[PDB]
Symmetry: C2
Subunit: 388 residues, 2 copies
């Protein structure tokens, strides 16, 4: 049950929830109104359970990708920032927080893969994927390799597959088209081809996984890897002199890593929606509010322009943002589950020579198209009947 | 709109609808009440369209497999024959006309594959599948083959795959369990194995399709084929001296062809449900009523014991019934679409050596399990939301 005249906030235990509590303490000093921050266990399971009965927190913080599920279940209120408020944040971040074209959360922070490089082996990392084969032959003369990154998980190989036109679902006019899937187009094929022949030509090994690639980079055996901000604290400990930069281009187009956006939704059942807006818009989403959170536990790159400009003095955080701006927002729809599953197989099969590139992606597209067409029958029959 | 005090009946243009009209004329002589028989074009598309708006015929005749769809959309009334009436029909036929364990149609006639044989080449057709390899070597000395039937379509190869324990969905207590699929169990594997090695050993060709098998049998080139009653009129024209008999056993178990049951449902929106029951139970489902239909266009084997015993003087119609009693009722649920699609691939791949038997069925089971699990999310999300 859901107390009026105060805010309850849930946010994950690995965030700066003590910093967020200082923002709640400022709100109260200014306003007289109490803010309570909690970090329950298993919060993203607990939220849709408790909020369906029309209880829960007023505000929930989590990765945007799961809010598409919450919104679809009617658990998130539509938010109402004005145009001037929208303008304070990088415009691509509002595209991560829509459901049925309506805004359903405030973007807070942004995360994406970047190119991580050893500055001692490689003072200037390559601008293009095309140059990596030659760079590799040159480094292998020193007993070093050019690049090693997790090849087993589509999240890591997608940025190259997407560079030339690959995509999960087409996004147009604030909305995904679930019938327009871009896994077997000519872009995806050209990229996966370039990848598979790095392996054929012996510049990568089809078996390289997350820990193998992380050990090589942190032992100074390879000049480059591809990883996110969660990896930087291991690289600091390794004392490798590293830098973090823009991903290489492919056919002159930017690599397109998937982008995760830590967001704040408002419970559809809260009687404090205007209070939640005021707290989010005028206290948290300000340079002093993001600073308090980030000082407790770093946020990485943030959606608020004014504060990202301060953070982006760290070139590593600048690189994350540049790569995120160039990347593909992770679609927040439940059909994204079909993609992970089909594409993981396709890549692992193209990579190991089990299938050709053209064959592995063609079949991926088929499987995804089929799972969704079945999902939507489930839907048109769940619906017409659930109504009665 | 849906006139009270008379019956409107729809039945397909390839049935004995003029014979059914004579039953309607008897009802009227006895009863004073008018019966109108129609055979619209595209009736099984037209029925769920018109009956949703709560119009249509009082009674619709079609293959039972599509009534599961109609029932699920609330377009069929639950029927209420008593126990004594149920007893007039072979008990396995009432298992083809349930939805959510409730009766939703009256079984009229039954169809299934049988073993068709050339009596001149083969006066005694083999009792077991195991004996076909030796029989083949013996016939090939005469320039003849033992068996040829469509291998491209799972409907035709399923009876052997099912013999030893293969199944689509498990049926228990009047209901299918959509989570219990039996395509990769040890039964299905043993059967498909026996099939694939008939091809490896050169007794069958993986490329044989419907017309190839039909030409061979009707030219007297092969001693046996597997086909249904729709094929008998071509074999009559060929003047081959043929017989129709029980399918061979495999590991001592009966082959299990899928069974189609021509059934009669009652429109949920009809005000004449008691009239429709009376017409179906006391006029159509009697020996004089089935005779009038069958005299116009043969029904094949029928569900009514008293009349099937007259028909079963034709050994060909007896064979159809014996095979149907031994076979697997075609499941009437919409998830059966997942089966056709996955199993067709599995068989064609095991057959051509693209995959092993163990691998092709394992993957079939996976694909079917996945499509249904996606269908049912579509469903649990279509539902909970459609309600609101």
């Amino acid at each position: 049950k859901i107390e009026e005249g105060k805010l309850v906030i849930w946010i994950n235990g690995d965030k700066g929830y003590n910093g967020l509590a200082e923002v709640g303490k400022k709100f109260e000093k200014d306003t007289g109104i109490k803010v309570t921050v909690e970090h329950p266990d298993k919060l993203e399971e607990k939220f849709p359970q408790v909020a369906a009965t029309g209880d829960g927190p007023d505000i929930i913080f989590w990765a945007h990708d799961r809010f598409g599920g919450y919104a679809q279940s009617g658990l998130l209120a539509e938010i109402t920032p004005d145009k001037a408020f929208q303008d304070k944040l990088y415009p691509f971040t509002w595209d991560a927080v829509r459901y049925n074209g309506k805004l359903i959360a405030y973007p807070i922070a942004v995360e994406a893969l970047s190119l991580i490089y050893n500055k001692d082996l490689l003072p200037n990392p390559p601008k293009t994927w095309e140059e990596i084969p030659a760079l590799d032959k040159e480094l292998k003369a020193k007993g070093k390799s050019a690049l090693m990154f997790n090849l087993q998980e589509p999240y890591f190989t997608w940025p190259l597959i997407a560079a030339d036109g690959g995509y999960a679902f087409k996004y147009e006019n604030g909305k995904y088209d679930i019938k327009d899937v871009g896994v077997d187009n000519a872009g995806a094929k050209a990229g996966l081809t370039f990848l598979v022949d790095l392996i054929k030509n012996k510049h990568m090994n089809a078996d390289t996984d997350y820990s193998i690639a992380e050990a090589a980079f942190n032992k100074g055996e390879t000049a480059m890897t591809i990883n996110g901000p969660w990896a930087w604290s291991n690289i600091d400990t390794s004392k490798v002199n590293y830098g973090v930069t823009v991903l290489p281009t492919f056919k002159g187009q930017p690599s397109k890593p998937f982008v995760g956006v830590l967001s704040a939704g408002i419970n559809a059942a809260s009687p404090n929606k205007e209070l939640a807006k005021e707290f989010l818009e005028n206290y948290l989403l300000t340079d002093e509010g993001l600073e308090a959170v980030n000082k407790d536990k770093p946020l990485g790159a943030v959606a608020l322009k004014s504060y990202e400009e301060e953070l982006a003095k760290d070139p590593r955080i600048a690189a994350t943002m540049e790569n995120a701006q160039k990347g593909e927002i992770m679609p927040n729809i439940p059909q994204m589950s079909a993609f992970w599953y089909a594409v993981r197989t396709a890549v692992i099969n193209a990579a190991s020579g089990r299938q050709t590139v053209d064959e592995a992606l063609k079949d991926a597209q088929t499987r995804i198209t089929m799972l969704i067409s079945w999902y939507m029958s489930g839907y048109h029959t769940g619906y017409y009947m659930g109504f009665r």
